[PDB]
Design a binder for this molecule. Structure first.
Ligand SMILES: NC(=O)c1ccc[n+]([C@@H]2O[C@H](COP(=O)([O-])OP(=O)(O)OC[C@H]3O[C@@H](n4cnc5c(N)ncnc54)[C@H](O)[C@@H]3O)[C@@H](O)[C@H]2O)c1
Ligand SMILES: NC(=O)c1ccc[n+]([C@@H]2O[C@H](COP(=O)([O-])OP(=O)(O)OC[C@H]3O[C@@H](n4cnc5c(N)ncnc54)[C@H](O)[C@@H]3O)[C@@H](O)[C@H]2O)c1
Ligand SMILES: Nc1ncnc2c1ncn2[C@@H]1O[C@H](CO)[C@@H](O)[C@H]1O
Lengths: 485, 484, 485, 486
């Protein structure tokens, strides 16, 4: 694989002729993303992101296209790739390359390396394209990450450079780990300090998802976080809105498009009851499902029980479930022995950021036979028991793989937060050390206020006497730092 | 257009090569349709529909496909068309023509005249193909109808043949009415008693939906119901499950695939609160929408308010609605004046059986301009205000237009009812007069019990003393007027 | 046990002094019962119930009080008793005897024989007083019944008079069957045709509840229904609102006042899923309960499953239920064997019309020991296992036992239905045979319209073209007779 | 002038000691629904961690609180109690606490309680002073257990006025309760000049149970006036996200039911505030078929309300259409006289926040509206100028405890397990604390949730070693980062 280059723009996508359809959907989404449109208006004259060379790794969807065109409206240059092999919306990839005033013959947009249905090798090739700016002396200077893959390639790449060697992989390492190290080992043959110089140049990363933020905390603990990070997942207007209400919308959409399976009346097992598992359980309850939940954390478990759900183990419940969904952010939730315990024509999916919640390696090597039904839907049959299971998106996050991910108006909260985090890190970069930060409460309130307004809600304004009573300013922030909402 | 013919089967569909894909979905659907599979097993030996020549007008979906193959398993011959221009699922139509054991080169299934995105003239052409059996002495002898268009073609066609003329249309008559009359008028130039002869041969009709049943009541009140009918829509296991729970599933699905618009937080206006409007409001509420409802019937309105929804008129709430769904079975619910009042980028769709709940004709001649976004999704802009509305399925039923209609496990209730009714009408035909009937309660209980078992529910069995106390048999459990 | 007499009114109640308190609540109920108030206004001049002498057997609550004073406003005379030993609200009984313009020393309302906490003997004594008008030439001429006990005393009583004997009770007939047969046998010693004369004089009965209507069909099938009946339970505005939304309100109220037990997080078993069971499950699910449902009817079971509830048997689920509610109208749902299987401190109650859904007789003779906690709440302990169960209302309907029954705005639908039925049977009496009838749909629609307006709902008016398309009158009725709403 | 009753050497003031048998039956039922407290009694029985503590507790004297007090004494503490609201006490539970599990009304074996349902303001502050004044002048209170901060306010303001040498006069337009509070302090200062200072000096810490009290603690700490360590129990995860939310989902509708019996389904309901209590209120009403709108100042909470299906509206625009109006803000001046006069005829008005000043009751009472009492804690106020009447619950005091019985035992077992642990931590590890507001470590909140999951029969999954390593947590927890919001 080699990049296409048209009118001086390098990229790799499914089909540039999808641009007109992508544009139409982008325009509809701008009307549903007031957080982004408000930032474009507010920062238009200032051009806060001038001089930024942002390397972005985030599902290449309609919603992300409105984010990329906000970063460029605000002065940044970007290069983009998806953070999952199935999450790209090819029409939005084409509209980003062509830009709002370009055409497929005369594209005026930005470099995108993303299509729906990548292989592992192609995913990592695309991530290196997205991180590799064309002037050796102007490498990337910011990262915008969802899941931490862009940050991992940079920091691991530098670690192996400083060690003088890319380790061999073990035979029993996951396939993707072998691909990742192959990419790094190969580049190190011909370029000995690429990643060190990129890490040096990067002024900060913004990280969008609970899984990526866990990895940031694990780099910071090891003394390896080489630039400041803003944990955007934990903006109040991201975690409590995207993770929860986003998933309430998009889980059932993925299930619907993949399977068309009636949800009402079915037993549904949701593994994990954090913000995503709360959204899943709310979606399924609302469609008439009989929902049970698994958990390791007794606080979240007590919430599930308070919300009308039994709290059970996968060992006890797996044989009775019609639909099983993993939502933990952890690995090894649904192992091969659990899959072989499922009832005939049960459905299995994962909505967590990575596919290793479901033992797909074990399933693929087990001797079960696969019939592909349609893209991202496979029927796996075990000849020993006779039973077949429907697996969505090969265990990758099913809302993006089987449908279109969260809706624009939800993503307007997450991406307003991301945009503000990118502005803060770029323009006030000296104020940040090499640690993980969260945005101040006032800026999350700012984001929520734009969306209340857009939905026609009417905020009450505190009187002077009331503000004094609460010990807050009339304009906020209104809550203490540890407030949980 | 003329029909295609291959291996002795006449048909008109989008693409035979889709049969493989459709067959994989049909097989998964069979595991989700225990009502139909239970009937295939029960009646396999008896072959109750041997001799039946069933003309079917019903959305050509994966679910219909399992129904069609249950009829043919039971001994019937069939010819099929969709009952809407956008509701066909092309891979299902291909699998039905090819059959379980056929191939696209050598198909071995049954005649289907159906594709997604028919024009009006093509829809009525296909309906005439579906009702026209190849041997003139063996015309259709049963109809299986959803919405009454097959029934109306036969009964109106006979009416004109008896009058000796097909009347002209009026200039202000609907476009679809002109097409319908053109078909009948054209045919009556070469064939003077085609529909009269079909009418005579048809032993009965089964009708699947609320709008179709109203039309049967209207034919029957005019003294024009020429053959018996079973109202399948009003089986308990149909109206209270398909119209309500089916729509709870498929309305969100249609809206999602057409628009990907967040439902939570939005103001949603549902017009009508019968079983389909009750399923729409339950779906929307479940996604966190702020739902209001319109209604003419004070009983249904009081239910909506007891279920946590304001009951408002279109005039008062149209200006602020983010999504508007018509679910009435009536006409003229969202007129052009209301559409001009909508907020920018609001969404408008209909889930009733016919498009005339929304004033599409008014919209198409208003001076608003259309941009097609993707199939069945159009953006209409009024330049005087600058505001745009997203219209789903050009006003046609959005769950089947924009998505896949109700899920198979729901359609298994409706289609087990329709298969029982076809059986009852065909094998006990002399017991029925020319009136509309509903299935006895015990046959509805039998369809419910197949699905409770499929879901793992555990029924209690009455003791002899309890059965005596209630005055029921241990095996129907409710009075005839019971409402569930 | 003899009636009290004051200012020309015979009555038996707890305490006349409660009349002021009762009257304040009656006045507030009148604002919440626009169905009854609209009927008082409508028929004020006509006086349609002039000449009626209505014997009423119906829970003597604040809601029934507004019904009683609507019947008297329309010209009827009345004599009343409760239809359950624990459902009376003493301050309502006192306001009804005193009247809107009386005082406790000089009452000016109507005969009431009802108090909360009757014995069985007192219950049947009161039922006889209510059915026994003072002038033997003017016996009762209508019955207004809820549960059919008034109707049963009249028709069985006549039945024994024509046989010339009241049959002896069997040793293992229920305690209340013996009481009932003792009343009739004692009266038959001094009066040989009392019940025969009342039955001849009764021109109609209106029957308010599912269990009463069932008994009406059983009388009718036997050839023994001596006068016309209107089944008020099966008014659309009764069954689908009182039985369902009434119960959604008053089930949790009963369990709250009896036990104050958290409902959220708890496993709750609802026996029966008709309109009452549907309201129970909806109330419990709304409080975060984990609800399962039992059923004999596959159609109601499939609804419960489609509404997110497992459908289980008592035997499978009884051991782990924290709250068990019987809602069937049948008998022998929770037997002694099931109660010994309950978890310690589980709560057991019945909301169907009669206590025999729960095997109280078996409990009372089991060797378990009772400790009364407060009125209508008892703790039963089995010393063999050490476990105790909380029993509400000694098995009698708990919403009225432990709390105040359905709220006034619900009872306004049921009681406008019952007032219209009394009007129709009394004024159009020649139109009816000795069969059970239901009110015409337009009278149900009229009752709904009054409450829609009271809540501020805004009905759409059909155009002439729309009414022609539907084949309906613009003024209704709007649905076919078999429509199920 | 009230004086304590003294029986068998126990000083108290309650409605009726003969209710103790009925109280005890309800306490023993509650022990079965309070596994958090029963587990702590078993765990710390032998240790007696609270020996030497003299805890002055100010918290709604309900059945649930009685199981908390008996947990504190089981663990070695001595106590003296009072309610933190004039209508919240459950007289049978007050009687059972004085009599104790082995005492009788003639021979009580319990502890000093100064609480009954229906106190006047004067009696409420008299009772608060009894609760804070231990009998040995040389053994004053050494811990405070507070809900709403009233006990902490009397001690800290009492000491402030002592150090100043004067209790300030009240302003004519000060609220009535403020005039009572200063009267109490001004009178005691006449005869005892250092009472509150010695108390403040003896108190080793306070635990504070509610969002209102915790605000007041932050306000003392801001001003340099928090004279001893405080633990904010409100903000334990298993308190704020359980009690505030699911407790209120149960008890709001209970209080509305017992006061009014008004159908909730089909009514328009206005909830003012969408924090944890307003979320519980809206979930309760939604589940009963109400049509709910929400008011809010905070755009984050408002956006959650809209995402959960509720319009976000101002009181000015929605007040005239509301059938029921509930305040759940913790602020003051939410529903003013002008808004009351705007309500529809026979609308219901109540407050569920800790203090009654959310509803302008002073303005209502001085307006010229006429009051008819319907029954305890239910009043019908009529405006002769408009002809409209409104039903007001609990004279504006928290309606779940005033009109019903407050949150259910099983919910309070979380709050009171937290409070009991907080009291153990502050008494036994006192040198580890400065004069600041603290929250309990996350591991202890997990411990409390786990007792309740187990009691409900939920089954927790156990992390494998590999999973624990992947997450970077211990298999035994804690499982979430410190800023985790659940
Ligand atoms: N799309 C689908 O999958 C699907 C499924 C089942 C039924 N249907 C169709 O949906 C439609 C409704 O079916 P149903 O079973 O709910 O019928 P219904 O008769 O039970 O309900 C329709 C409701 O609309 C109300 N109504 C009529 N005119 C109105 C007006 N002008 N404004 C407001 N409300 C009005 C009526 O009072 C009635 O309660 C029919 O056309 C039916 O054939 C579609
Ligand atoms: N307490 C109240 O205020 C109140 C209100 C309305 C009705 N009622 C009473 O409630 C009872 C139920 O009324 P309804 O209108 O719901 O009647 P219903 O006939 O609509 O429903 C009862 C359900 O019980 C089911 N059932 C019968 N026997 C059973 C068994 N052994 N196990 C499981 N399920 C069984 C039936 O299948 C039926 O669906 C009647 O006694 C009625 O008079 C009480
Ligand atoms: N439509 C979408 N476009 C871009 N990102 C999305 C979309 N839906 C979900 N996500 C993001 O995917 C992340 C997990 O990789 C979540 O943190 C969520 O914000």
């Amino acid at each position: 694989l080699t990049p296409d280059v048209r009118n001086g723009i390098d990229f790799k996508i499914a089909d540039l002729s999808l641009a007109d359809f992508g544009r139409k959907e982008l325009r509809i989404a701008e009307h549903e993303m007031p957080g982004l449109m408000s930032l474009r208006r507010e920062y238009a004259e200032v051009q806060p992101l001038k001089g930024a060379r942002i390397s972005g790794s985030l599902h290449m969807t309609v919603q992300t296209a409105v984010l990329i065109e906000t970063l460029t409206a605000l002065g940044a240059e970007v290069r983009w790739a998806s953070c999952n092999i199935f999450s790209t919306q090819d029409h939005a990839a084409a509209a980003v390359v062509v830009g709002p005033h370009g055409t497929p013959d005369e594209p005026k947009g930005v470099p995108v390396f993303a299509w729906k249905g990548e292989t592992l090798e192609e995913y990592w090739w695309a991530a290196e394209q997205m991180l590799t700016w064309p002037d050796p002396d102007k490498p990337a200077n910011m990262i915008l990450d969802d899941g931490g893959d862009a940050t991992m390639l940079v920091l691991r790449g530098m670690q192996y450079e400083k060690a003088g060697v890319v380790p061999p992989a073990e035979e029993d390492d996951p396939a993707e780990w072998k691909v990742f190290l192959n990419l790094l080992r190969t580049r190190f043959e011909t370029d000995k300090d690429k990643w060190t110089k990129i890490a040096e140049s990067v002024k900060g990363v913004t990280e969008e998802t609970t899984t990526g933020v866990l990895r940031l905390y694990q780099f910071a603990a090891a003394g390896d976080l080489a630039f400041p990070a803003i944990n955007v997942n934990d903006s109040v207007t991201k975690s409590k809105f995207d993770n929860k209400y986003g998933t309430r919308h998009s889980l059932i959409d993925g299930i619907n498009r993949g399977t068309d399976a009636l949800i009402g009346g079915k037993k549904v097992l949701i593994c994990g009851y954090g913000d995503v598992g709360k959204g899943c359980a709310e979606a399924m309850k609302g469609q008439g499902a009989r929902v049970s939940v698994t958990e390791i954390d007794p606080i979240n478990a007590l919430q599930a029980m308070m919300e009308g759900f039994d709290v059970v183990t996968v060992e006890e419940a797996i044989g009775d479930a019609d639909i099983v969904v993993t939502a933990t952010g952890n690995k090894d939730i649904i192992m091969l022995e659990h899959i072989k315990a499922m009832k005939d024509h049960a459905i299995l999916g994962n909505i967590g950021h990575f596919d290793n919640e479901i033992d797909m390696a074990g399933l693929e090597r087990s001797g079960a036979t696969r019939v592909n039904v349609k893209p991202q839907v496979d029927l796996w049959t075990f000849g020993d028991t006779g039973r077949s299971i429907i697996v969505l998106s090969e265990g990758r996050l099913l809302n993006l793989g089987n449908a279109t991910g969260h809706p624009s108006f939800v993503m307007s909260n997450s991406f307003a937060n991301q945009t503000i985090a990118q502005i803060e890190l770029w323009t006030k970069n000296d104020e940040y050390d090499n640690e993980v930060y969260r945005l101040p409460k006032h800026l999350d309130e700012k984001v929520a206020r734009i969306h209340v307004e857009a939905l026609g809600g009417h905020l009450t304004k505190l009187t002077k006497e009331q503000a004094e009573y609460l010990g807050v300013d009339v304009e906020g922030p209104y809550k203490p730092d540890h407030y949980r909402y």
